[PDB]
Symmetry: C3
Subunit: 136 residues, 3 copies
């Protein structure tokens, strides 16, 4: 498996930030990797990956709200037939992937940092992200 695993999620609304930290960690533990990096990569162009505050759900609510204002869903100048241009912008804005450091078997994250799958075009039943580990 080359320390690579695909994870599956079902999302429940257009916009959703799903904390995936524990899934990543549990799987690092399973592989036995102690030091290196983890690449966490959405397989989608309308859902991304970010790191942000892990405790107050109002942070992620406010992130979703602000991004909805920065990139409104409807725009008169949009040409992309599918209608989900805003989700493509949001995905490129937070990133499709994040690179995390692994030290002594743990993700190197501050106390309040968690890893989120950022759904911008839900609800969808088939969402996926990949985690790939590289060891020192």
């Amino acid at each position: 498996h080359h320390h690579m695993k695909t994870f599956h999620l079902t999302t429940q609304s257009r916009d959703e930030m799903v904390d995936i930290t524990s899934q990543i960690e549990t799987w690092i533990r399973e592989t036995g990797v102690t030091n290196g990096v983890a690449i966490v990569s959405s397989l989608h162009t309308t859902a991304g990956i970010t790191v942000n505050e892990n405790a107050d759900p109002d942070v992620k609510r406010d992130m979703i709200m602000r991004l909805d204002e920065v990139y409104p869903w409807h725009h008169e100048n949009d040409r992309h037939m599918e209608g989900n241009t805003a989700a493509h912008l949001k995905t490129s804005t937070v990133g499709h992937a994040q690179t995390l450091i692994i030290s002594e078997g743990r993700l190197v994250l501050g106390t309040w940092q968690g890893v989120y799958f950022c759904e911008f075009d839900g609800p969808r039943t088939n969402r996926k992200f990949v985690v790939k580990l590289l060891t020192d």
Copy 2:
């Protein structure tokens, strides 16, 4: 071998998203790397790298259009007299670099993911990105 290759682009307009997936894949094949990661990095402060929809050109058109509204070219509060502040914002917003996973001698990309060089201050004759592979 260092598994690092630099690529040259000439861009033809202020804003341009150029699909560079083939350059990256071709270099992976040439190096014989089967599993690991690829770091794709712009050498510029006014062009970045992103992963987004790789089939409908209207996605790229709309991305450029939306970014132009988020970061208008002319802004009364700008101090940077060269006049390309907006390009600097766009570059930091999409990122100067992306990290991709390599599995079975190919990039791990979802169905519609491609890698784009995002020119925000063209046309320019000597744009560069670097592809660095790391092996398992």
Copy 3:
């Protein structure tokens, strides 16, 4: 395992601090020649970016534009602490950046420097980490 923590004290709400030289000094001390460096903020309100390292007006303008895109005060914010805008700016530039190391130097274009982006200062003992992976 070539990982080091660095502390910074920031001096205003918004500050872009050039950390390039600090990263490069670590690399030189470890003797790592080729690989990658992962530069990662430990904070949800400060990020890491790569941008223009010569003209201070670029980073002034970056801070200004970000403050317009994500205004500090917003009637619809529910996060009562008041620093929502810092969270958005952090996710927008990124909490971390990956840099290539070649011949003991960061692979950076002429005007490219690495910045710690404070969006909720001034604070003491802001931190980032640098992890090196060698070929």
